Amino acid sequence: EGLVEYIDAEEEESILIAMQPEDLEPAEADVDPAKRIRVSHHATTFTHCEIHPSMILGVAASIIPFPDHNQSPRNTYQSAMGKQAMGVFLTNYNVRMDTMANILYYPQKPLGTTRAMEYLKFRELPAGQNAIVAIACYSGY
Amino acid sequence: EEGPQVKIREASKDNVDFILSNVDLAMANSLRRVMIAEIPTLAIDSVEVETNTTVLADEFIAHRLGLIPLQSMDIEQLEYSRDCFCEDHCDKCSVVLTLQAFGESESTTNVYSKDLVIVSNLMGRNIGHPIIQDKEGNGVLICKLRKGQELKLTCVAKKGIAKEHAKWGPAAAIEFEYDPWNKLKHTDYWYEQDSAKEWPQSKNCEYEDPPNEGDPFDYKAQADTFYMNVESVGSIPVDQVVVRGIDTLQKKVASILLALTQM
Amino acid sequence: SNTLFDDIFQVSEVDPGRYNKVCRIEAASTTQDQCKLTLDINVELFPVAAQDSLTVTIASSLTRSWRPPQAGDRSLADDYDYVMYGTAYKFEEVSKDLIAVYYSFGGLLMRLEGNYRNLNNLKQENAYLLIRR
Amino acid sequence: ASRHGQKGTIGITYRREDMPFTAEGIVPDLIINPHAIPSRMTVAHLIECLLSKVAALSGNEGDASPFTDITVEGISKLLREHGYQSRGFEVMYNGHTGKKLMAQIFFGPTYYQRLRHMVDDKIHARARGPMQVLTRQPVEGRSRDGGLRFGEMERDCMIAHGAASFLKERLMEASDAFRVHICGICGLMTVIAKLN
Amino acid sequence: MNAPDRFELFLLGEGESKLKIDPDTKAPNAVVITFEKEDHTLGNLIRAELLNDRKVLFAAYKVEHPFFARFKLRIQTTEGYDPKDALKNACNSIINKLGALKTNFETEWNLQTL
Amino acid sequence: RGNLMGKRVDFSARTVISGDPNLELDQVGVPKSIAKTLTYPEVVTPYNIDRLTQLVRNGPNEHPGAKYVIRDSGDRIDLRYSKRAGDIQLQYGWKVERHIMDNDPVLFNRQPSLHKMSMMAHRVKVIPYSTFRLNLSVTSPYNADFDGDEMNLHVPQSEETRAELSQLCAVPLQIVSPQSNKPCMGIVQDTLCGIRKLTLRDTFIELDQVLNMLYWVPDWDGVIPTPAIIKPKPLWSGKQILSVAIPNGIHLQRFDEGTTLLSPKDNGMLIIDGQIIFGVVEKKTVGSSNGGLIHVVTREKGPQVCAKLFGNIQKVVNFWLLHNGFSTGIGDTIADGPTMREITETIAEAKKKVLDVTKEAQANLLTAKHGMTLRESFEDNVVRFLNEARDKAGRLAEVNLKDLNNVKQMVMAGSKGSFINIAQMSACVGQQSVEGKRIAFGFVDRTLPHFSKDDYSPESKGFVENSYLRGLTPQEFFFHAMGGREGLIDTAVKTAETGYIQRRLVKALEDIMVHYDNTTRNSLGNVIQFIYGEDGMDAAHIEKQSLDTIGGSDAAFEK
Amino acid sequence: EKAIPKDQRATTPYMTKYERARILGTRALQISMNAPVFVDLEGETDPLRIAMKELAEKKIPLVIRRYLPDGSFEDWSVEELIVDL
Amino acid sequence: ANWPLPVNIRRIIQNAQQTFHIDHTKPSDLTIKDIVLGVKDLQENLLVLRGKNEIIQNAQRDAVTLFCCLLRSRLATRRVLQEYRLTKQAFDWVLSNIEAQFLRSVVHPGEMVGVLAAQSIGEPATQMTLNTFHFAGVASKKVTSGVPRLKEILNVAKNMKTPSLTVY
Amino acid sequence: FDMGGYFIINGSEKVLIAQERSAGNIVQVFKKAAPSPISHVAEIRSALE
Amino acid sequence: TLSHLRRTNTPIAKPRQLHNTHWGLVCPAETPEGQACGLVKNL
Amino acid sequence: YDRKVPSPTGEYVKEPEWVLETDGVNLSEVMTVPGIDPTRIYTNSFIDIMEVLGIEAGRAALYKEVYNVIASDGSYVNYRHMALLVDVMTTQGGLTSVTRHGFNRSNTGALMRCSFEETVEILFEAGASAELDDCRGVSENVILGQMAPIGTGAFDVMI
Amino acid sequence: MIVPVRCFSCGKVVGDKWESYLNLLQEDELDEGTALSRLGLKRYCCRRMILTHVDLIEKFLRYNP
DNA sequence: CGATCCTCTCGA
RNA sequence: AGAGG
Ligand SMILES: [Mg+2]
Ligand SMILES: [Zn+2]
Ligand SMILES: [Zn+2]
Ligand SMILES: [Zn+2]
């Protein structure tokens, strides 16, 4: 229908993209202080618009809660981490004959999820547990 | 009526909201500790697996079985197998349960705690019956079966305290709070603007009198009034949780006394 | 020994300074024209308001394990309100005949300026600061 | 590991009684160190916690998605209505003594991962065992019951300490050691060793 | 694998005694009682009750390592009072305090309805 | 390199390590398994005979046991399969390979073994559980933490080999490092955090807490120190019961800033006879500092005496803190309502100064100083304004964080954290750089295709206005990710490079040693230094001392 | 040849940590290999702890041969070396 | 002023002050001849080398030159009495303690210095951060810093990356 | 839940790792250092399908 | 599994560094540390 | 550049001065220039200092730069250590690098050198020239599994 | 993979609550929060056990074996 | 020549 | 050689 299109890096060179669809094309004439400070759209000669900013990441980072509130390398480390974790890798484990396989007894879906996780399944085949954690210095152990 | 005073606010089949007045902190805490892991009960300690054709592993099921709450009313009328003179277990030291279930219908067959049946001599003791609190009367869902599926196992339930394994607790969360005004200054409150506005008042504020800002801090004062709520898991009734709680502590203290006599 | 000092002081200013239980007090003598006093007080226990006049003293008795109070023959040089134990750590000769004393009550410091502290203080781990009404 | 690039092994296991408790009776399943926070600057960890506490209570999923309008103030707003103090803190009592902690604890749910690599799968020790075919030195790998390497880097450390007689033993009596018959003329290992 | 048996926390070992009394070398009239297969449940309770007795000079407890089920109690008394008997007396009072609690909670329970 | 300079060895072990606050400095927690696996060849003497015969009796499966009994003629007796393993009446001269037991000397190591302090002798303490247990104050020389790190343990087999460990390589002997003439180990983390806390002037303790605290010190005299307070409620200061861990004859003096012997800020340090007089104890005192408690206690009272210190310091602090707690909440990053406005105003004026400097450059009224490009002058100035802003907004945060601020508290103790961390989390993350220049035009004439061409603005070239608490935008995110990646690359490049560099030195200086005339020479016997270090002095025994004749006026010198 | 005169020697009269460690070791080895003990081992039983006692009492009959780069040596008896460290 | 030297003198003076319980109100029992000749006889005993010949004795004099400046500066006649207020008993002990500590502070023949020095440079280098020049507060201060610079040096690079000349 | 995209080679599941390469037929210019006798170069990575 | 199936290898001027153009095509975060950091990337 | 220098009174005071910073080296030609201090002129190129002012001046420069890389990263190391390295490079007459071309080419042992780089080539060069090892090197004894003349074995035990 | 018996944290019998929960959301049309409150799971430690549960058994049951 | 070590499965 | 601490 021509409402959406595929752009490669070469063609990207010639276009002007908007990050948010609404927050990037309104009008001009108080604000939430807790919210992040976003720059005004300024240039208004758009050819395209981002489907959703979050789509710059992939499988790995799309599992991280609030990566936009983390120091750059921490997000890269968590990217290696999830791969070294364990849980229900597939429903058919009972049926497969794999050299080494670890499955969680009682896997839990995160209490805090990414909209991306839906497509990633995750909530369906988890890798962790919603542990009640205390940040405190107890026995020094 | 002399010494430590008790005042029950609320009482139910599995909950006791009381006020332990005129007691040292150590006392209220040690009793809280003993109620968590030292009051004995009955729970599955062995599982013999004849047939398992289910999606769940033998030990996964065995694990779940151990957690299953069992009537532990007359537990002092049962021995620890370690004390029993018998080869392995018996009727004086253990309750044997059977569990045979098969996928009858094409429709998914659920294996409940009600499906566990005693195959040992109880000797008129209120012991080994699986605790069912479920309104439909099924209790804990142990496993799920398809059609060709079947589970046939035998399990020996033994006596124990939670200190050995969490499954052995009449447990559940135990509410504990002393001084709902910090009149003792036992905790320095964290804030941004004002502690009173950002910290919420606990229901126990109703009973105690507020500090009254125009008064200096009570130096020599000590904690004696304790607000507590003991929750029963079902193995033992609530009254008995606290009573056997008091008892176990009392018992293990008297053992230290007759230990001095021996040496 | 017996009391080695006795003077009624007048509070000039009260300062918490990042603390909530401790307060550094600035006091001046009611009798002497030069005798100054600067000391830390556990205000949570004994509140020291502005424009207060307090009787300060440094005794020596009322070495071995500290025995708890106990309701016995126990009678201390305490008829007072606020009592501390300290240690001498420095003695400053603030020119001419003016002397300065330095006592630490386990962190709660003390500074007393005067002249007549001759047969009063020595470099001893002994100090007993009694303060009343 | 938490979902914010910070691994860790279990230090110790404490049973419920010893564990610090809340005025409700809630207890941690895990205790993390306050020091493993500022150096790394993982605020999302603290936030992912705050959101999960509010989530479990309300009975709703936590929108932890990145480029959103979800604020700490917003999450806090609800949690404060949901009874608890808005910043994740809770008054806790020491399980040993039963006395309140002077410091309030940042408590609440946080999704953690069970990581592959477990103590027992790594524990290894070898007081003499199978030798290599060629080099006559200990074999490689724990499954083969091999030896830990005493590299050049470790030989340096010993040569720094001055421990010469240890360094010899660690390279002779432990590992390979051979007695060869040397020619008093050649200086070679071409001597017919006809012992006994 | 290297983990001990969970009963080793309440079950006394082969040739193990619940109370081991040793004379304190650092000071006169003091004792170092070692409690085997006991924790803070008992430690704190006894020590807090010892402090209630006026004739007690010093009373403190320490569990040197969490892995182990031991606990060390140290008692110093006034001249003419055996600290072994100080344990006895304090330790006795605890039973009485609990005895009162039991019969008082029981009175309240029957008075309540549900 | 593989089979001669280095090699796999016997009587070695490896496992995941974990810290233990109830372990001594020179101790190592060896799991039973490993302790059962490793042996020592002990010859049968009349002094040992009784214990050894009892050890043989226990056998390979019971811990204080043994496997293998070597007879005269060197024929071994495998105890797990010997028919007469129950028999065996030991004879003098026979060797008994006994299990590794408590208080045995063992070489503990962590790779990369970059300096001698990475490889130290320890006292064995056989424990249950699967991990290699160790004192936290040994974390630094070895360079470990407990996020999964494993360590190597080797066991000496000769009587003379075990001497070399205890007499030269022992943990207390290695406290004062020759490398930096300062101690290499100090009080860390919780202890470093909790010492500061307990030792505050405001901090006071009751009868009950004091006694348990005193009894926790092992080498305690047994005498209750007199309470600092003897009025309604006999109270004690933290400063007091901590001074119990400090030994006799210990004298320490500091003076930091507002330090006036009457110290209003409770800063600096005064320790006399081994009792604390004033000041708060922290990193400068109880850390691995040049003039701190440790360099003093080691040199003054002894290495064995000093090693014992950490333990006592840890036992009192840890206990106190265990019964006090301390967290880190998200609230600790939530800086003031009006304080945020000032931080936001800072970025506002920072952004304006750039706009102006840009407008000025675009107008050709910018005349760059000698040596640097008109354009490179612009960049330098812009970067400078933004860095100033980030620092200022960050200083605005710090100067608002309450004393009850958990983050600030660690930074104050020096346990963890720094200013930048506060700044970035609560105020403003700041500018991102790659190749030292700001975010470059990867796309023709732009950084991102969501911006117009020729956009030299802060936000276009990678300035993160937002804090970590507020969160980064999609642009800010990618830019930070670009900068973050650089770090990650030149960490891997540095660990590769520094590693090789090390080996190269270590090979060139290998054979260099002090001879029996203080001559620093090689294996050929060629003089490098006629006197070592130019004085013929050992590097550890040295310490910075002010030379009072070099400075001051000629008038002051005479007086 | 080679040697050095007894009252003509510049090497430290003090025993190095290395000379101590090696001496303690060599003796402990002898003690453990059922060799005579030249001091009353009042209480003691560890061969190294015994070697340490023998040293403090100065009853160790061993001589340190200190080598000089040129190929010369100074002979210092354990019974004469200062042990300050 | 502050420079790494064996024997912390401040501590010894503080030790004697505590050990002998020095009172700042009583006059000392020391002669000017005692202090002057004492500190003088002390430095003659602060040995590093022992050789009877000229060269070694000059080398010995040379080795201790700087330490003696501290000794002399700290143990001057005025200081000993005016500041320290030391008695003879206390002062004599100080001299023995200084010598004791100095002889203790010396290096041990057999000490493997090469390996030490190498690891002493190596280990710190292995901790270095930010390849982008630290001394560069401005672009006109962008000189090679960190590991790239350290590599340049160790390799004795004929083709120096940022060659600069600082002219006075 | 299985996505495919892999191969089963002797019962073992193999993923073909996508390989990055510089695209051909592209015209590019590169400035040559300083010891070089030639100042600039124009290159083409010519190849057929 | 999914993250393995979306891996990209670059063999052997400066690559490694998250280039501007990588926006929306390669993940900024998901990359290994050391060995081949940045050469191994993920879509 | 701020310079701490003694005042007429004697006490040290900061006297800020003007210093010229270059982008290139021709030291020999810049020191022979009017209106400068030729006694003070520095270069980050210690190799030129060596060529213009001699080996001994090169040593002082080599260190000044080594110290500077360590110091720049906030770190402190004791003088003796880098003093040794600096001296090691210097003690040959010229600037001997810590590369396979610098120290590993010097007239030491043969088993001593092969342990670093060029392993086989070193052993082959020992083939042609009939090399002799004193075995007073660490590596040689380490290779031969002998108690090397290190701390413990740096002397002998008699009776 | 089947509703854990008893809450990991506190131990409240949760192995029975599941079927009732799934019907409270279906037939009763209730929201998870009120449904968790209806079953007596007051503390969040309990709440996460039921809320956060993924009952994978229903998928494994689907295989014929 | 290009840090150390550690587990490891897999052709040929 | 590759996969990963
Ligand atoms: Mg690590
Ligand atoms: Zn039985
Ligand atoms: Zn021959
Ligand atoms: Zn719960």
mmCIF file with all atom_site columns, N, CA and C in Angstrom, chain C residues 101-115:
data_model
loop_
_atom_site.group_PDB
_atom_site.id
_atom_site.type_symbol
_atom_site.label_atom_id
_atom_site.label_alt_id
_atom_site.label_comp_id
_atom_site.label_asym_id
_atom_site.label_entity_id
_atom_site.label_seq_id
_atom_site.pdbx_PDB_ins_code
_atom_site.Cartn_x
_atom_site.Cartn_y
_atom_site.Cartn_z
_atom_site.occupancy
_atom_site.B_iso_or_equiv
_atom_site.pdbx_formal_charge
_atom_site.auth_seq_id
_atom_site.auth_comp_id
_atom_site.auth_asym_id
_atom_site.auth_atom_id
_atom_site.pdbx_PDB_model_num
ATOM 1  N N  . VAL C 1 101 ? 43.702 23.845 78.145 1.00 0.00 ? 101 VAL C N  1
ATOM 2  C CA . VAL C 1 101 ? 43.628 22.407 78.432 1.00 0.00 ? 101 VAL C CA 1
ATOM 3  C C  . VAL C 1 101 ? 42.857 21.696 77.318 1.00 0.00 ? 101 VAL C C  1
ATOM 4  N N  . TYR C 1 102 ? 43.233 20.435 77.028 1.00 0.00 ? 102 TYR C N  1
ATOM 5  C CA . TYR C 1 102 ? 42.609 19.610 75.996 1.00 0.00 ? 102 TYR C CA 1
ATOM 6  C C  . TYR C 1 102 ? 42.224 18.227 76.503 1.00 0.00 ? 102 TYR C C  1
ATOM 7  N N  . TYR C 1 103 ? 40.908 17.994 76.651 1.00 0.00 ? 103 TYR C N  1
ATOM 8  C CA . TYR C 1 103 ? 40.344 16.729 77.118 1.00 0.00 ? 103 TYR C CA 1
ATOM 9  C C  . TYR C 1 103 ? 39.423 16.109 76.080 1.00 0.00 ? 103 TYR C C  1
ATOM 10 N N  . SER C 1 104 ? 39.570 14.791 75.854 1.00 0.00 ? 104 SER C N  1
ATOM 11 C CA . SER C 1 104 ? 38.739 14.011 74.928 1.00 0.00 ? 104 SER C CA 1
ATOM 12 C C  . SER C 1 104 ? 37.949 12.994 75.729 1.00 0.00 ? 104 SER C C  1
ATOM 13 N N  . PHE C 1 105 ? 36.617 13.033 75.608 1.00 0.00 ? 105 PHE C N  1
ATOM 14 C CA . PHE C 1 105 ? 35.702 12.125 76.300 1.00 0.00 ? 105 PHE C CA 1
ATOM 15 C C  . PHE C 1 105 ? 35.204 11.099 75.285 1.00 0.00 ? 105 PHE C C  1
ATOM 16 N N  . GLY C 1 106 ? 36.154 10.314 74.777 1.00 0.00 ? 106 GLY C N  1
ATOM 17 C CA . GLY C 1 106 ? 35.928 9.305  73.754 1.00 0.00 ? 106 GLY C CA 1
ATOM 18 C C  . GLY C 1 106 ? 35.463 9.909  72.444 1.00 0.00 ? 106 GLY C C  1
ATOM 19 N N  . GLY C 1 107 ? 36.014 11.065 72.096 1.00 0.00 ? 107 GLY C N  1
ATOM 20 C CA . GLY C 1 107 ? 35.625 11.757 70.876 1.00 0.00 ? 107 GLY C CA 1
ATOM 21 C C  . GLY C 1 107 ? 34.963 13.088 71.139 1.00 0.00 ? 107 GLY C C  1
ATOM 22 N N  . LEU C 1 108 ? 34.195 13.190 72.248 1.00 0.00 ? 108 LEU C N  1
ATOM 23 C CA . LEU C 1 108 ? 33.565 14.446 72.652 1.00 0.00 ? 108 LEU C CA 1
ATOM 24 C C  . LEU C 1 108 ? 34.689 15.284 73.265 1.00 0.00 ? 108 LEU C C  1
ATOM 25 N N  . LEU C 1 109 ? 35.172 16.281 72.517 1.00 0.00 ? 109 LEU C N  1
ATOM 26 C CA . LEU C 1 109 ? 36.306 17.097 72.938 1.00 0.00 ? 109 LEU C CA 1
ATOM 27 C C  . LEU C 1 109 ? 35.937 18.205 73.925 1.00 0.00 ? 109 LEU C C  1
ATOM 28 N N  . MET C 1 110 ? 36.960 18.813 74.572 1.00 0.00 ? 110 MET C N  1
ATOM 29 C CA . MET C 1 110 ? 36.817 19.863 75.587 1.00 0.00 ? 110 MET C CA 1
ATOM 30 C C  . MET C 1 110 ? 38.043 20.786 75.603 1.00 0.00 ? 110 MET C C  1
ATOM 31 N N  . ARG C 1 111 ? 37.804 22.107 75.709 1.00 0.00 ? 111 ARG C N  1
ATOM 32 C CA . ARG C 1 111 ? 38.859 23.124 75.775 1.00 0.00 ? 111 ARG C CA 1
ATOM 33 C C  . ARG C 1 111 ? 38.574 24.170 76.859 1.00 0.00 ? 111 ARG C C  1
ATOM 34 N N  . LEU C 1 112 ? 39.455 24.247 77.865 1.00 0.00 ? 112 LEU C N  1
ATOM 35 C CA . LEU C 1 112 ? 39.313 25.201 78.957 1.00 0.00 ? 112 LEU C CA 1
ATOM 36 C C  . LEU C 1 112 ? 40.539 26.109 79.045 1.00 0.00 ? 112 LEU C C  1
ATOM 37 N N  . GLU C 1 113 ? 40.309 27.435 78.918 1.00 0.00 ? 113 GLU C N  1
ATOM 38 C CA . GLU C 1 113 ? 41.331 28.489 78.967 1.00 0.00 ? 113 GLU C CA 1
ATOM 39 C C  . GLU C 1 113 ? 41.268 29.238 80.304 1.00 0.00 ? 113 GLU C C  1
ATOM 40 N N  . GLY C 1 114 ? 42.432 29.524 80.891 1.00 0.00 ? 114 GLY C N  1
ATOM 41 C CA . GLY C 1 114 ? 42.529 30.228 82.168 1.00 0.00 ? 114 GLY C CA 1
ATOM 42 C C  . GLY C 1 114 ? 43.924 30.676 82.547 1.00 0.00 ? 114 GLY C C  1
ATOM 43 N N  . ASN C 1 115 ? 44.333 30.395 83.813 1.00 0.00 ? 115 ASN C N  1
ATOM 44 C CA . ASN C 1 115 ? 45.642 30.773 84.352 1.00 0.00 ? 115 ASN C CA 1
ATOM 45 C C  . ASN C 1 115 ? 46.080 29.929 85.555 1.00 0.00 ? 115 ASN C C  1
#
